[PDB]
Amino acid sequence: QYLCQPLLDAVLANIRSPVFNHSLYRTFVPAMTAIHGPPITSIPSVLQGEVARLDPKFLVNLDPSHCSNNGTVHLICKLDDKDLPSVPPLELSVPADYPAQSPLWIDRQWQYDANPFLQSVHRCMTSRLLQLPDKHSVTALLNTWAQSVHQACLSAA
Amino acid sequence: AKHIFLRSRAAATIDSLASRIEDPQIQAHWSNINDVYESSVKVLITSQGYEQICK
Amino acid sequence: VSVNLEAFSQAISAIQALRSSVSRVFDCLKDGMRNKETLEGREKAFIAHFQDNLHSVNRDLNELERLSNLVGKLYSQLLQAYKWSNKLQYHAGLASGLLNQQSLKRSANQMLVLPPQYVDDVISRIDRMFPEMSIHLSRPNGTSAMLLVTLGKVLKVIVVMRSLFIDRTIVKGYNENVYTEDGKLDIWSKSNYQVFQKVTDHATTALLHYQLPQMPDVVVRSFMTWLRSYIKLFQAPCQRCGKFLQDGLPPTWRDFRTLEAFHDTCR
Amino acid sequence: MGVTCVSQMPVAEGKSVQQTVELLTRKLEMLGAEKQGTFCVDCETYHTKLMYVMHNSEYPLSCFALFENGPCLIADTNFDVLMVKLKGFFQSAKASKIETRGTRYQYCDFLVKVGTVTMGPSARGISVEVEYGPCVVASDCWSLLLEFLQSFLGSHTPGAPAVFGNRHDAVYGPADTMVQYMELFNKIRKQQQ
Amino acid sequence: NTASLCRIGQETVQDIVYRTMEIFQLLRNMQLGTYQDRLTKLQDNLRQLSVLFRKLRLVYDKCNENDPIPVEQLIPYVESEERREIAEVNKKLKQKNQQLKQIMDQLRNLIWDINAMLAMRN
Amino acid sequence: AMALLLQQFKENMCAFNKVLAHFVAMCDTNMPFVGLRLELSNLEIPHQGVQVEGDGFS
Amino acid sequence: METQLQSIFEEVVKTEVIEEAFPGMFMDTPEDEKTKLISCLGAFRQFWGGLSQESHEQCIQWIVKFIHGQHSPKRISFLYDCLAMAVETGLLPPRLVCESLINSDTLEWERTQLWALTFKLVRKIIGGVDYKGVRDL
Ligand SMILES: [Zn+2]
């Protein structure tokens, strides 16, 4: 500001002119040249990474059915835990632009029915997924599945 | 009499520990000035060949 | 005083910055108008870039003037020696500071007795500095050393050392009686105050902390330096909870190598 | 021996002395203080200038002799007997006996004493004493005392007793508390109501 | 005879590091009678450091020639008369240690008794 | 002060009371992660749920 | 007039912030829809009992703005269930709710899950509307 108002006034009163560059060059090239001399001489990566960094209790892979190589992918899950029994596969669908959103779980009510243990698992599952917050990931849901199975097994015996 | 008894048992437990387990070393040094009511020790746990590093 | 050297160096840096800023201003204005894709950004970018250089020039001139207000009032081969000597002490000074931290030794072994005058002169050499500290030595019993250290109008410390190795410490206030009925030093007693008991525990931890393997003088020097910080007690608050009192106790913990007050609960 | 502050708490525009006293004691017990006994402070004036003779239950083997601006003696309990011997040069100045009574609380090296002041049978004031233990230098610890007083009093907090005004490195002693008590007693005997 | 050589080479490595640190410290302690004494001490330390470097080189040259079996192979995961002679030395040493225990507990009791009796002679 | 919530933990020589020590241990060790989770959410970074990694201890 | 309703249906979709930390800690098990819906429909019934003739529509308008304002689609599905047995009992006419749902400007084809769920719900309650309402729909 101070000591430089005339330059600001000159620049503002000169701007958006077709010959501004020519004027500036012709008025300021020679002294600068003389004083100093010459001038200077499919599947998104996030899903692949999160699958790579999951606990070896899970071996999730692509669904043999449904579409592929798109923004929305489908995965089928299997649980291999020595301390827990076998449960339905609990497949998932991943929408496009997975970060900053949440995946959804495809419920299969008839699969979990006809057994008190399996429907106890299912009601604990519904409770936990209602307890999960927004913007959650798939690893959190898988861990919730494992913990719900463990809690149901503990409650049974 | 009480203080004498208590001191002798503390010494015996430290020494039995030193003689029974050898995974970490244990070492004690007693003081040199002493009273009729109090006493002191310094106890120090170190590995057999690493006394300079892990102390 | 050595502040003039730093002031002169800052003035040199300021004038170099001023010259560079003027050159930058004129070169940037000579460069001209750029493209910047769309028209609207092209208009704003040039003005924004032009204002900043002038503002920097004004700021540099203002700070240079602030410094100006702040400032005030065979031989060659000799100088070549001098400018070498101060180049050595600093060069080793860093090298000794970086090798002691990363000690690679594993054990002292491969594959104590001192004259009383040595200890007396070492303790006197400690006593000559720190004018507030006053140290008195005695040997009522054998060769063991009993030292009474008085600090200001606040602290009285009794230290029993076994052949220059510090062994036991008990601290008390100012008005409390430190001598026995016979007149000798009272070794086995308590301070009858919670804060003084807590700082006795702190002193025990400190003496258990400072442990060099083959330099014993630096150990007592560090202990005395740490004990020096306690004179400022009751006037300095904790660095975490702000207030002086926590459960009725003032800050009684002085961190090692960074001597600042702290409450015991604040770690 | 430690630094001591003596002040007067106003009656708070209503109620009686006992209600204010029980409110203060309830606050103290809520903070975490505990009872450890009782205390009493008395004073008498003598004249042929004025002399003051005081006793304190905290120091059970002492008598304090005070002037308005002169020196101060700390004698043993026999001193009053000497006054009884004079009886011809210093009258007792009857109707000038005043006492403060109450109980003392201790909370982690602090001593708090809240008492009632009586002109004999009639009580007309409240006195508050706070004493710190480990510090002997006057004004060195003045911040801790201010913080504690603001802790259990809020408003009505005093500040900077006039005895501290000798801005040196002097050691605070038990004779200064008696000066503060004498000033407080003079203020109460002046205001009345 | 070769494991001892490896341990000696290791130890000489730590001594080399310690001597370098001591050299830098000694250069720091020099402040412009005794200056010749410090200079001779510096020369002695540098020459013994050079001897230590030579010894380390000799040890490395000796141990380099005498790997067929790689690392990470001998780590165990989840999935003749020497012993006879060694035992006697262990038992004998253990017996000696036990004897030292009796002397030590006895001397400490003696010092405790003299401390207790002398503390209150006044 | 106030009060904001209350939860009861599941019920499931001999003078040590090992369960209370274990609860204090895990609570102090694990509560630091809650603030960092909440802050990584608050500044809009996509994270995963706080989880035990590899071995059970960390 | 809406604060009480917002509170009730905020307790419907209540989210505990401290959760997802210390799993398997609270002894209590969260209530299922069989349990959760009965209580919610009773609360919404007592709210509906105290409303006037001219004020019936506006609150419902507000609530659809609340249902589509959530971000987790399954929570929106149980909110749809709340409305489904709200209209089934005759407490709410199954003509105001349909027009309130469809007329919402928050619903476009961009939101796939909302589209599918809302149109299935509209298909569920279409059988009890007079033919004029069907023509408008
Ligand atoms: Zn603190």
Side-chain angles (χ1 to χ4, degrees):
Chain A
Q1 283 180 354
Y2 299 141
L3 188 62
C4 295
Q5 300 302 300
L7 287 177
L8 273 297
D9 203 28
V11 169
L12 294 174
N14 279 39
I15 205 159
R16 55 166 60 75
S17 193
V19 294
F20 194 41
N21 279 11
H22 172 59
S23 288
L24 296 179
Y25 178 88
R26 196 259 292 271
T27 195
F28 285 138
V29 65
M32 300 328 289
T33 289
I35 285 158
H36 311 290
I40 51 182
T41 302
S42 75
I43 43 175
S45 297
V46 190
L47 277 296
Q48 313 196 51
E50 185 176 1
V51 172
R53 180 67 181 271
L54 55 84
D55 187 289
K57 290 185 290 187
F58 298 97
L59 209 58
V60 298
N61 45 6
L62 297 174
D63 197 14
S65 56
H66 262 276
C67 55
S68 180
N69 62 27
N70 206 4
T72 300
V73 77
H74 300 106
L75 293 156
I76 190 166
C77 310
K78 69 175 180 65
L79 167 63
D80 170 67
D81 188 17
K82 184 172 181 253
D83 190 32
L84 290 181
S86 300
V87 298
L90 191 141
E91 77 287 346
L92 280 83
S93 62
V94 171
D97 186 330
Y98 182 76
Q101 73 184 1
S102 51
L104 277 296
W105 177 48
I106 318 164
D107 170 8
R108 204 80 78 81
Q109 183 97 20
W110 69 266
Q111 184 65 262
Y112 273 99
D113 186 74
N115 285 137
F117 182 71
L118 305 181
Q119 62 201 133
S120 58
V121 171
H122 212 56
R123 85 171 91 71
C124 291
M125 272 286 197
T126 59
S127 69
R128 288 182 179 275
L129 278 71
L130 273 295
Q131 293 314 70
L132 265 174
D134 292 78
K135 324 303 276 166
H136 66 83
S137 176
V138 59
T139 303
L141 179 51
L142 284 193
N143 273 331
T144 298
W145 162 30
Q147 283 154 30
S148 184
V149 171
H150 183 77
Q151 182 178 0
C153 180
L154 213 52
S155 63
Chain B
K2 283 143 99 158
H3 168 86
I4 286 191
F5 190 57
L6 175 59
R7 184 179 67 189
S8 79
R9 286 161 82 205
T13 72
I14 289 172
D15 277 29
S16 89
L17 260 177
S19 168
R20 174 177 99 212
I21 190 167
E22 69 275 16
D23 313 328
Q25 295 298 109
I26 191 167
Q27 314 185 22
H29 299 307
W30 294 77
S31 184
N32 199 21
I33 301 314
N34 175 0
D35 183 4
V36 299
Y37 295 159
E38 293 180 354
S39 163
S40 307
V41 298
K42 290 183 172 65
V43 193
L44 187 153
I45 315 169
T46 42
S47 290
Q48 175 54 355
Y50 297 80
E51 36 282 32
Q52 209 84 49
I53 281 175
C54 48
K55 62 183 186 296
Chain C
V1 71
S2 292
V3 298
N4 285 122
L5 294 180
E6 298 287 73
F8 284 157
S9 196
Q10 211 271 327
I12 288 170
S13 281
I15 190 167
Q16 296 212 279
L18 179 138
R19 183 193 295 145
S20 64
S21 309
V22 174
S23 289
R24 197 195 313 136
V25 164
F26 275 125
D27 277 27
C28 287
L29 191 151
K30 174 193 71 93
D31 263 348
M33 192 85 168
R34 319 209 85 83
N35 225 337
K36 194 66 182 294
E37 201 65 5
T38 61
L39 173 50
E40 281 305 9
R42 180 165 49 253
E43 184 54 282
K44 284 182 240 154
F46 175 69
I47 298 169
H49 204 91
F50 172 62
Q51 289 277 25
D52 183 75
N53 306 350
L54 272 45
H55 273 111
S56 68
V57 176
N58 296 115
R59 170 265 321 268
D60 191 77
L61 185 48
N62 279 343
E63 66 87 19
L64 172 43
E65 281 305 9
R66 194 221 51 51
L67 188 78
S68 166
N69 285 319
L70 182 78
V71 291
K73 287 212 326 183
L74 171 76
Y75 282 123
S76 77
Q77 196 148 50
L78 183 63
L79 318 185
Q80 192 73 42
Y82 287 171
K83 292 193 210 133
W84 196 75
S85 79
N86 51 1
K87 192 186 85 95
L88 180 61
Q89 292 167 27
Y90 200 97
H91 174 98
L94 310 166
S96 68
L98 301 174
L99 267 293
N100 265 328
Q101 293 154 359
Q102 296 169 357
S103 50
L104 205 58
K105 184 63 66 68
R106 260 181 187 89
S107 177
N109 54 13
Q110 196 83 332
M111 179 48 200
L112 174 60
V113 63
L114 322 173
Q117 266 287 346
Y118 191 16
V119 192
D120 201 357
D121 69 49
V122 163
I123 297 169
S124 66
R125 274 161 31 63
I126 301 299
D127 194 12
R128 60 186 71 248
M129 61 285 298
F130 316 127
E132 293 83 3
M133 293 177 70
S134 182
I135 292 171
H136 175 37
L137 188 151
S138 179
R139 296 188 185 184
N141 192 301
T143 78
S144 280
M146 322 286 176
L147 281 71
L148 194 151
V149 185
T150 183
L151 267 188
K153 315 280 186 48
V154 290
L155 261 70
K156 297 265 191 68
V157 189
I158 297 169
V159 179
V160 185
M161 314 158 71
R162 201 274 320 287
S163 77
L164 185 134
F165 292 101
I166 190 166
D167 202 5
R168 264 191 51 230
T169 68
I170 298 99
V171 304
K172 291 146 158 274
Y174 196 73
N175 42 36
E176 211 160 354
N177 188 35
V178 65
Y179 299 104
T180 186
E181 173 147 9
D182 209 319
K184 319 184 297 315
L185 205 44
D186 193 16
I187 297 89
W188 317 90
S189 287
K190 295 280 208 74
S191 66
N192 204 0
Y193 286 122
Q194 279 77 14
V195 56
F196 291 136
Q197 291 162 353
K198 289 193 69 63
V199 66
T200 53
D201 291 331
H202 301 339
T204 303
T205 57
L207 63 84
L208 283 171
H209 177 76
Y210 293 127
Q211 280 287 93
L212 268 296
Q214 66 96 26
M215 294 296 172
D217 289 279
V218 64
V219 170
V220 71
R221 179 176 296 144
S222 299
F223 185 80
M224 289 315 158
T225 315
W226 178 86
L227 183 58
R228 207 215 78 91
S229 60
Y230 269 93
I231 60 199
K232 182 46 56 196
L233 183 59
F234 311 100
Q235 222 147 162
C238 183
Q239 308 288 62
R240 188 191 172 201
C241 52
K243 315 172 281 153
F244 302 109
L245 270 75
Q246 283 300 141
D247 291 331
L249 278 159
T252 26
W253 177 275
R254 292 300 191 275
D255 182 73
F256 303 153
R257 304 191 300 71
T258 44
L259 282 68
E260 48 254 26
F262 274 120
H263 287 93
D264 192 14
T265 77
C266 306
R267 309 306 168 177
Chain D
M1 181 75 268
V3 177
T4 303
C5 178
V6 179
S7 71
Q8 158 175 34
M9 178 85 171
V11 75
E13 70 93 25
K15 310 154 191 181
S16 62
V17 175
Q18 288 82 15
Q19 317 189 25
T20 66
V21 168
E22 66 183 1
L23 289 153
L24 287 197
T25 56
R26 216 190 277 115
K27 285 186 179 180
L28 290 200
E29 289 160 345
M30 177 48 98
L31 284 194
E34 61 206 40
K35 291 181 184 176
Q36 262 197 18
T38 181
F39 75 106
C40 170
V41 161
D42 62 7
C43 167
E44 192 146 20
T45 184
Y46 286 102
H47 70 317
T48 63
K49 292 175 75 174
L50 289 199
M51 204 178 89
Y52 298 116
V53 184
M54 293 182 286
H55 308 98
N56 200 324
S57 80
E58 175 85 20
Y59 312 101
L61 302 178
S62 299
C63 294
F64 294 85
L66 273 298
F67 285 161
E68 299 91 318
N69 303 71
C72 166
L73 282 184
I74 304 172
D76 63 358
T77 50
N78 266 312
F79 193 97
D80 50 60
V81 185
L82 181 64
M83 293 305 298
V84 183
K85 282 302 168 50
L86 283 169
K87 221 155 199 181
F89 305 85
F90 295 102
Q91 303 321 106
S92 167
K94 193 65 180 67
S96 65
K97 284 216 193 185
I98 59 176
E99 300 205 349
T100 78
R101 301 277 189 115
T103 63
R104 45 171 272 174
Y105 291 86
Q106 167 185 34
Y107 169 63
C108 193
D109 292 356
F110 283 87
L111 267 179
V112 193
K113 302 208 268 292
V114 180
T116 72
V117 184
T118 62
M119 294 299 291
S122 82
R124 55 177 69 235
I126 301 103
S127 79
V128 170
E129 181 176 301
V130 184
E131 159 171 300
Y132 197 44
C135 192
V136 300
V137 28
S139 78
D140 200 20
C141 38
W142 177 243
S143 303
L144 313 172
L145 272 188
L146 201 47
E147 182 152 349
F148 202 90
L149 288 158
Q150 280 176 351
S151 87
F152 65 94
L153 279 159
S155 172
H156 316 289
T157 308
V163 187
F164 290 170
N166 297 33
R167 304 331 310 200
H168 312 326
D169 61 357
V171 164
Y172 194 84
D176 299 326
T177 316
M178 295 296 172
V179 187
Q180 298 181 243
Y181 267 106
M182 191 259 310
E183 278 170 6
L184 171 65
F185 286 169
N186 267 336
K187 268 187 40 174
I188 286 158
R189 280 191 297 177
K190 277 182 210 147
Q191 60 182 358
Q192 273 98 9
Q193 291 97 24
Chain E
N1 210 312
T2 303
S4 184
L5 281 193
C6 286
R7 297 262 285 103
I8 284 299
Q10 182 62 255
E11 192 84 331
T12 51
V13 173
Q14 290 89 20
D15 314 288
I16 280 180
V17 172
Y18 176 78
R19 293 294 181 187
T20 295
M21 183 278 288
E22 183 178 1
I23 290 316
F24 268 121
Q25 184 177 2
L26 190 151
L27 274 296
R28 184 211 209 261
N29 296 115
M30 192 295 307
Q31 283 76 238
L32 177 61
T34 60
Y35 314 100
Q36 60 270 15
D37 189 358
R38 320 194 101 80
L39 194 148
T40 61
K41 182 188 303 154
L42 196 151
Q43 285 190 273
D44 188 359
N45 295 356
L46 271 293
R47 80 170 153 70
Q48 60 186 39
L49 182 62
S50 183
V51 172
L52 200 58
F53 275 100
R54 174 188 306 280
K55 169 187 182 177
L56 181 64
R57 180 48 162 282
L58 173 63
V59 169
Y60 180 42
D61 271 28
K62 179 68 181 294
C63 200
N64 215 357
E65 60 88 19
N66 44 46
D67 199 272
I69 304 194
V71 294
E72 212 285 309
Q73 179 56 255
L74 278 300
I75 299 174
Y77 293 73
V78 297
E79 289 293 327
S80 171
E81 290 305 11
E82 237 32 296
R83 289 163 266 181
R84 153 111 142 298
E85 192 237 341
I86 276 205
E88 289 90 7
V89 65
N90 200 314
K91 44 184 308 305
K92 176 60 57 183
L93 87 75
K94 183 172 185 169
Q95 192 280 327
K96 283 301 189 302
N97 276 327
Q98 219 161 226
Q99 277 307 48
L100 186 54
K101 174 56 55 178
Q102 302 192 18
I103 303 183
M104 198 188 302
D105 70 50
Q106 214 183 40
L107 191 57
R108 183 199 291 129
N109 284 120
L110 164 56
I111 200 161
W112 274 339
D113 291 331
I114 189 58
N115 290 318
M117 294 177 71
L118 201 43
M120 186 180 288
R121 59 149 290 282
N122 294 356
Chain F
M2 278 279 93
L4 275 185
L5 73 165
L6 290 176
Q7 279 69 58
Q8 162 166 339
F9 297 76
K10 65 176 177 62
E11 38 289 355
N12 184 344
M13 212 58 255
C14 183
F16 171 48
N17 192 327
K18 62 165 90 157
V19 186
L20 172 84
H22 186 234
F23 287 170
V24 182
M26 71 177 69
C27 170
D28 162 72
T29 295
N30 292 321
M31 289 314 253
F33 283 82
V34 170
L36 183 62
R37 188 268 300 297
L38 188 148
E39 264 312 314
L40 291 189
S41 175
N42 202 323
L43 273 299
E44 273 81 1
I45 297 89
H47 44 87
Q48 310 175 10
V50 170
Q51 53 159 357
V52 172
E53 152 275 352
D55 320 327
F57 18 109
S58 56
Chain G
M1 61 66 73
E2 71 156 319
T3 54
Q4 184 67 41
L5 245 198
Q6 162 283 359
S7 59
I8 298 298
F9 291 160
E10 183 202 70
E11 199 76 16
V12 162
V13 301
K14 58 176 177 59
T15 52
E16 212 281 333
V17 190
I18 313 305
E19 290 180 353
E20 207 266 330
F22 280 29
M25 179 285 258
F26 326 107
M27 290 304 67
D28 193 1
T29 72
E31 293 298 350
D32 82 341
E33 83 82 354
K34 298 193 175 292
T35 51
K36 204 65 180 300
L37 288 199
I38 297 169
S39 75
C40 295
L41 64 85
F44 184 77
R45 193 196 30 227
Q46 83 164 30
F47 205 110
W48 200 241
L51 210 51
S52 80
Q53 290 85 10
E54 73 269 349
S55 50
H56 291 307
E57 55 268 15
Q58 43 188 0
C59 75
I60 298 297
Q61 272 295 123
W62 180 97
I63 188 185
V64 294
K65 181 261 291 180
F66 194 98
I67 308 304
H68 301 297
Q70 303 325 287
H71 186 284
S72 172
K74 64 183 310 293
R75 284 231 281 271
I76 309 170
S77 74
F78 321 85
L79 287 160
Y80 287 151
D81 293 333
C82 287
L83 271 193
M85 311 86 77
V87 286
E88 180 212 24
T89 70
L91 189 81
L92 297 176
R95 181 186 198 297
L96 178 60
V97 57
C98 300
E99 71 201 53
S100 72
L101 282 152
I102 304 300
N103 284 255
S104 181
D105 59 356
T106 309
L107 173 71
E108 41 264 49
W109 63 279
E110 279 294 350
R111 309 282 320 251
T112 79
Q113 313 302 135
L114 293 174
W115 183 280
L117 269 53
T118 303
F119 276 108
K120 293 177 50 50
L121 179 82
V122 163
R123 188 257 174 279
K124 295 298 293 295
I125 65 173
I126 208 64
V129 193
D130 212 339
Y131 48 82
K132 299 291 181 68
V134 189
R135 198 213 292 165
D136 166 21
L137 265 168

